[PDB]
Design a protein around this ligand. Structure first.
Ligand SMILES: Cc1cc(S(N)(O)O)ccc1NC(=O)COc1ccc(Cl)cc1C(=O)c1cc(F)cc(C(F)(F)F)c1
Lengths: 400, 532
């Protein structure tokens, strides 16, 4: 085993365990008992004061440990810009790879975790890891020389295919037809078993301003309000001639004929919005930020950026079948889709700004989480205009 | 007797050293008593007579024959942290009903666990003299009052209970402090047999379990509750009768009364709380008002009600019903079969900056959901006083992600509804008020007003006002002066928020006035436009 330490001055994580359902508690007890037998984890005493949240996801349960805090405190240790171009990418879970590998004896205590007991009738069951844990920053790192070796053949065999590893995941990207792609995948799984994304389609959609036979005072008002705000992204947008038609105290419903100047102003504005603002580039030294807005009725808008109004990417996400009555389901789903793209594109997860109340999210998100990784998030209050603005984003002619 | 169990490796906080606290001098009367108690503990193997080698020391005292007291406050300051000794305490509503339950006191008197030999030196203490050298000692077992004892004690009991547990799956043992609660659905004679097998098992590990004189029996005192075999009740709540009440008395009383509103229905403390206004001292005597006397009087009567509940039956449904007792106040009861409550509750009125009733309803649902998972590891099926159409209409449009687990409608007034719903589009044939307000934020002098498309107009002069208040006041005036349908244009940023959230309660008296107005209109369209 290789010595791993915490960042200088960093002490271990002491994150409290959230309550779990009897269903999940039973599941973990069974998983962990089997793991103990195989020597992957061991029970610990009260002298180990550390702790990391744990839970179960998904038709059998999988154990998922929330190592975000530990990953942050773990000492530090490349991205293939080609992955994003590939026609199709398949994601694979290679976390089991780590169990074989032992974890430095001195670092184990920091992996301490607790299985809670219903109604606090009994003390929780404490364990720590003996081997590389799935979900820890250091695992993919330590098991790297081992991962290249097993990948070299498949890689060198197929120099056309790019393979990128993130945490417990493996993103395999190529250009073959859908069938020839899935075939190459198993050839790899088999190769591994012995030890559906499409980036070229993710097009950045433009903002489209409304067009009307006749405009009303209100029509212009709402329009001018949005353009004004948008003036923060595009400085060339003007609302002068539009605001002039808004002179007076007309009925919100009165029709206003447009002057030729307002017509041109509206045309120059449409042209400016024809393309993403110039000069936006990704900066590795900076954090990625993903903001989401609830547009309503299953629709969601998001923007990925590092500097306000300098989007690296924006988009829409429509709720998936069987998620109608569940806002929390739709949001976690969206968060996972956006995080995934982020990894595919930059090889790192973005920090999220979620339009949800802390208590609401922390109570139910694990119920629909399906990734091995967990991003960072903060809870926010959506500004009305930001929502009204991205709601204007362009959509397919008929669909896709 | 000490237990033949492995020691837990203990350490002192980062770099800190053992305590060196001067021994508080005692009287010959107290020294003799200590010398005795300590010779008794020395023979039992609990403490060791030690030399001057030890540079550490903890003060020993004498309280009450006499009882010895070692002040480890300092050792505890220098002792490493441990895993929070099971912090959340059990609620009677989560206890599964069992045919028999027996309590086993594994307290320190009956339970002695060895101390990490490496650490024993930091526990050193000294029995004073009548000037001359005093008698030095150190603990060989977990000291009563030391930081790690509760945790190490609990961890040890767990190791020891592992075998028994695997062998008797029909039996359940709950751990809480010095007590073990053992229950089962076995025949009473078989249950008693297993208890005895367990006692004999603890005896084997150095745990002299109880005396027939120290055995606890039903009902059980569980933090304000009385646990009977088939149900639970609550220990009587006593409201002292006096002719002289001080601030402190009233506060204490309010305290005890707020707890009672959880279990008892109808408890009120408004008039008792009024008595606290402008109080200058805790000892200050506040004469009870007429209403306070009546309230207190009616509460004394509500507490004479036999409020009882039942135990958990995992083979039955878990149901939670909610009522709105008043604006921001929510009451609830969780049961499995009608009228037999496992638990009841009330959530103090939340004074948000601005929100609505449907939102407050989800927050109640979420708090109950969290409580349930802790207590029962399951979430209840909800019975909420809100229609499925009202929920659909609200949640689907709201700017914030929100949700309610599986629920159904129960028509039990008052019902939660949307007090108003801003129009989606401008209203045709309705006056259009262009409102605006401004004020010098320094002089706090401002004016508010509007100009409608129909020629109507107004401006009000306001002193001691903010810009926000004038803008909102502008809106308010437009709401007052308009008909039942009105379009209102404003460049107020806070108004933009109202269009988004459409609150029905807030912190501002002004916003509140506006809401009352919004509610009263048959149709209202709010349009925001940038200023200038
Ligand atoms: C109170 C009682 C008496 C009898 S008996 N032996 O007929 O007198 C049988 C069942 C019960 N109780 C039940 O059915 C449900 O309760 C229980 C169900 C199972 C177990 Cl193991 C204990 C209890 C308790 O009554 C109890 C009492 C306490 F003070 C503290 C605690 C604990 F710390 F764990 F929270 C539990």
């Amino acid at each position: 085993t290789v010595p791993v330490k915490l960042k200088p001055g960093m002490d271990g994580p002491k994150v409290k365990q959230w309550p779990l359902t009897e269903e999940k508690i039973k599941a973990l007890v069974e998983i962990c008992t089997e793991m103990e037998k195989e020597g992957k984890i061991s029970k610990i005493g009260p002298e180990n004061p550390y702790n990391t949240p744990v839970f179960a996801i998904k038709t059998k349960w999988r154990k998922l440990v929330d190592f975000r805090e530990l990953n942050k405190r773990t000492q530090d240790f490349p991205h293939p810009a080609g992955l994003k171009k590939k026609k199709s990418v398949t994601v694979l879970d290679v976390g089991d790879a780590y169990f074989s590998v032992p974890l430095d004896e001195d670092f184990r205590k920091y992996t301490a975790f607790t299985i809670p007991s219903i109604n606090n009738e009994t003390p929780g069951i404490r364990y720590q890891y003996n081997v590389l844990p799935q979900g820890w920053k250091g695992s993919p790192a330590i098991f790297q020389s081992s991962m290249t070796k097993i990948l070299e053949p498949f890689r060198k065999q197929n120099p056309d295919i790019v393979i990128y590893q993130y945490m417990d995941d493996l993103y395999v990207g190529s250009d073959l037809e859908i069938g020839q792609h899935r075939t190459k995948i198993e050839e790899l799984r088999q190769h591994l078993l012995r030890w559906e994304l499409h980036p070229d389609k993710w097009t950045v959609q433009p903002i489209v301003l409304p067009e009307k036979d006749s405009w009303t005072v209100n029509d212009i008002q709402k329009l001018v309000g949005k353009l004004n705000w948008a003036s923060q992204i595009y400085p060339g947008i003007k609302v002068r001639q539009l605001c002039k038609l808004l002179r007076g105290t007309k009925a919100l419903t009165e029709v206003i004929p447009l002057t030729e100047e307002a017509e041109l102003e509206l045309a120059e504005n449409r042209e400016i919005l024809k393309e993403p603002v110039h000069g936006v580039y990704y900066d590795p030294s900076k954090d990625l930020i993903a903001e989401i807005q609830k547009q309503g009725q299953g629709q969601w808008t998001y923007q990925i950026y590092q500097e306000p109004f300098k989007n690296l990417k924006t988009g829409k996400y429509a709720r998936m079948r069987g998620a109608h009555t569940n806002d929390v389901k739709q949001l976690t789903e969206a968060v996972q889709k956006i995080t995934t793209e982020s990894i595919v594109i930059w090889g790192k997860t973005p920090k999220f700004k979620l339009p949800i109340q802390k208590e609401t999210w922390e109570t139910w998100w694990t119920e629909y989480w399906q990734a091995t990784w967990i991003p960072e998030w903060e809870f926010v209050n959506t500004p009305p205009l930001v929502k009204l603005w991205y709601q204007l984003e362009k959509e397919p002619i008929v669909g896709a | 007797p000490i237990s033949p169990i492995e020691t837990v490796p203990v350490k002192l906080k980062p770099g800190m050293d053992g305590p060196k606290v001067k021994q508080w001098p005692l009287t010959e009367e107290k020294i003799k008593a200590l010398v005795e108690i300590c010779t008794e503990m020395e023979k039992e193997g609990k403490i060791s007579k030690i030399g001057p080698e030890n540079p550490y020391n903890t003060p020993v005292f004498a309280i009450k024959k006499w009882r010895k007291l070692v002040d480890f406050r300092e050792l505890n300051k220098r002792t490493q942290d441990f895993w929070e000794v099971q912090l959340g305490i059990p609620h009677p509503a989560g206890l599964k009903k069992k045919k028999s339950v027996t309590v086993l006191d594994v307290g320190d008197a009956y339970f002695s666990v060895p101390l990490d030999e490496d650490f024993r030196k930091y526990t050193a203490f000294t029995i004073p003299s009548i000037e001359t050298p005093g008698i030095r000692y150190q603990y060989n077992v977990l000291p009563q009052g030391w930081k790690g004892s509760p945790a190490i004690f609990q961890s040890s009991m767990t190791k020891i209970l592992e075998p028994f547990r695997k062998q008797n799956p029909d039996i359940v043992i709950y751990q809480y402090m010095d007590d073990l609660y053992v229950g089962s659905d076995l025949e009473i004679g078989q249950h008693r047999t297993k208890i005895e097998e367990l006692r004999q098992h603890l005896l084997r590990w150095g745990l002299t379990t109880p005396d027939k004189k120290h055995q606890k029996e039903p009902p059980f005192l569980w933090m304000g509750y009385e646990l009977h075999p088939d149900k639970w009740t609550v220990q009587p709540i006593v409201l002292p009768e006096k002719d002289s009440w001080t601030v402190n008395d009233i506060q204490k009383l309010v305290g005890k009364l707020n707890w009672a509103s959880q279990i008892y229905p109808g408890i009120k403390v408004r008039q008792l709380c009024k008595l606290l206004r402008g109080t200058k001292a805790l000892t200050e005597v506040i004469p009870l008002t007429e209403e306070a006397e009546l309230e207190l009087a009616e509460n004394r009567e509500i507490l004479k009600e036999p409020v009882h509940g039942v135990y958990y039956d995992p083979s039955k449904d878990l149901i939670a019903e909610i009522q709105k007792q008043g604006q921001g106040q929510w009451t609830y009861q969780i049961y499995q079969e009608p009228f037999k409550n496992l638990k009841t509750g009330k959530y103090a009125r939340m004074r948000g900056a601005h929100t609505n009733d449907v939102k407050q309803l989800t927050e109640a649902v979420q708090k109950i959901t969290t409580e349930s998972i802790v207590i029962w590891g399951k979430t209840p099926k909800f019975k909420l006083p809100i229609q499925k159409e009202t929920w659909e209409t609200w949640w689907t449009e709201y700017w914030q992600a929100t949700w309610i687990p599986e629920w159904e409608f129960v028509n039990t007034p008052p019902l939660v509804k949307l007090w108003y719903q801003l129009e989606k589009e401008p209203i045709v044939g309705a006056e259009t008020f262009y409102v605006d307000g401004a004020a010098n934020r320094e002089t706090k002098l401002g004016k508010a007003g509007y100009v409608t498309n129909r020629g109507r107009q107004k401006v009000v002069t306001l002193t001691d006002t903010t810009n926000q208040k004038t803008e909102l006041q502008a809106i308010y005036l437009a709401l007052q002066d308009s008909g039942l349908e009105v379009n209102i244009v404003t460049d107020s940023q806070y108004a933009l928020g109202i269009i988004q959230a459409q609150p029905d309660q807030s912190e501002s008296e002004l916003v509140n006035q506006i809401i009352e107005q919004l509610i009263k209109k048959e149709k209202v369209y709010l349009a925001w436009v940038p200023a200038h």
